[model samples]
Target chain A: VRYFYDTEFIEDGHTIELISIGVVAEDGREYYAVSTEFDPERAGSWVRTHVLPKLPPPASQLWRSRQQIRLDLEEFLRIDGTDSIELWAWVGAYDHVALCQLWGPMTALPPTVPRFTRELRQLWEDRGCPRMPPRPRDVHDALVDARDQLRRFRLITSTD
Target chain B: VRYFYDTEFIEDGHTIELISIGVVAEDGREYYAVSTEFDPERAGSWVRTHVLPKLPPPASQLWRSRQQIRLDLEEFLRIDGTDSIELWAWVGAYDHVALCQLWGPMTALPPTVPRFTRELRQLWEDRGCPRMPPRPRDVHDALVDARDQLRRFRLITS
Candidate 1:
């Protein structure tokens, strides 16, 4: 199975903390959650303005602990003893880092989740770096961004 | 200009500490140094065996403060006022992360240093993932690994 994903995160150059994640599968399933764990104090002004406001309310079911999200993601992706599923994201260097970190360490990452995230940005580059569709309207909302990746992937891979 | 680089580091899932970095420029210039800052005790047994033993002695001139290496890298790479230089590395997400951390925060990184390190592994994939030649013998040492990246880059792009 293939999944297109996006993550909202905070970075201080030295560290990355996942604020939220969204994954949309080829079969039309979707998973999204905001982590209650990341420190808002660590966020720079840009994140506070662009991302934090988009999060669900503190008491919403969408808010989850990092461990809870990890287990939910495993079940959502059907990560059952096989590394057969493929995950893709745009300019995903840190998105991959944040996702792997849900398990605490690289060694602890489940084998079911591929060791690497296939880069949509790289795939875009591979095709002569074409100018394509506009990005999703809801920019930093992880679910919207994840859906945008799927849209672009289909358009780019289409022979038409 | 294109430069291939590598870093030796210690990662405990939550944090990454740079132990050393090596850069090999297309013009045949090279820079390498081990940082005096990382806590060696934080290293795993695997890193302790493979990477630590390869670093220069603590008293060696090859050991420099992270600040010194950052300055030396800026000068050697000519990261002047332009982002004209290109950096390449194998599976380099964390390598880029480690390199940027030298300046403490991403905001402090010089414009001369590109924000991203182009992935040689991705380039290999772009080319139908061909079988490559043998890797360099000296494995975890930063300089040797950096040189190997350069060698492989040339072969892959050839």
Candidate 2:
């Protein structure tokens, strides 16, 4: 199974804190959540101005704590177990880090989570630099980006 | 003693790799080094264009390996030991992390180094938000920034 994921985070050079995350499974199921646990004051200027505004309103159903997001994310991804699972992201270095951080530290990450995120950007380059679908205008929204990743991946691997 | 410092780094969400670091000790001493060990290819677009160009040429005396830089930094900051020293930076969360990472992991950090970096930005906020010295135009160079931090801090606490 393949899972396409994206994360929106506030990075202060030392720590990357989750503001939101979105995931799209190969089976077309999708999950999205905004983290209530991150500190808005810690966010850099760019994230504060652009990314924060797109987040769901404070009291909305989409909001959850980092702990809650982690548990729900695990349940969503581990429905069939980790053995045959693959995680994909675009320029995913930080995405993997941010995702791993959800479980606190790298040492505490659940056994079910994959240790690496395969990069869709790298894959696209490896597959002859195919032109990807147009990037979505809602770029910083994690769910929107994840859905787009799935869309681009399909186009990259399409036999037609 | 207060030691104002700055670090230029390449961050990809997961890790911060030091490109260069600069420190200004309270007693009019300064130290700066560019890490030969950083992976420049991993640098993000902005860092490549803005920060990387500011680094000294490859064979310049300013460049040193991360291990060498770490040892030298320890000597510079711990001249009399960690007890009397305070580390300060401008929004320095990542500078502290990148500095700590020099010894590999946080657990392996030498006891001689301070565990936290005091934030000059926070101190400014607490001090009634004084008008700061204009930021340097030659920004992103760690040494230049470190010197500016020291200058601003003097004015903030003056």
Model 2: lDDT of residue B7: 90
TM-score of each: 0.91, 0.53
| Leading candidate by lDDT | 1
Per-residue lDDT value at B146 in model 1: 91
lDDT of 2 by residue, A38-120 (tens): 88988767888879988988789999988899889888888456356678887665577788777764556777676666666
User: TM-score of predicted model 2?
Assistant: 0.53
DockQ of each: 0.50, 0.04
Write model 2 residue lDDT over B68-131, tens digit each, in one string.
9988987888745646777778766557677777775445677656656665664675478988
Full-model lDDT, candidate 1: 0.85
Q: Which clashing pairs does model 2 show?
A: none
Name the regions of candidate 2 deviating beyond 4 angstroms.
Answer: A79-83, B1-158
Fnat values, candidates in order:
0.35, 0.05
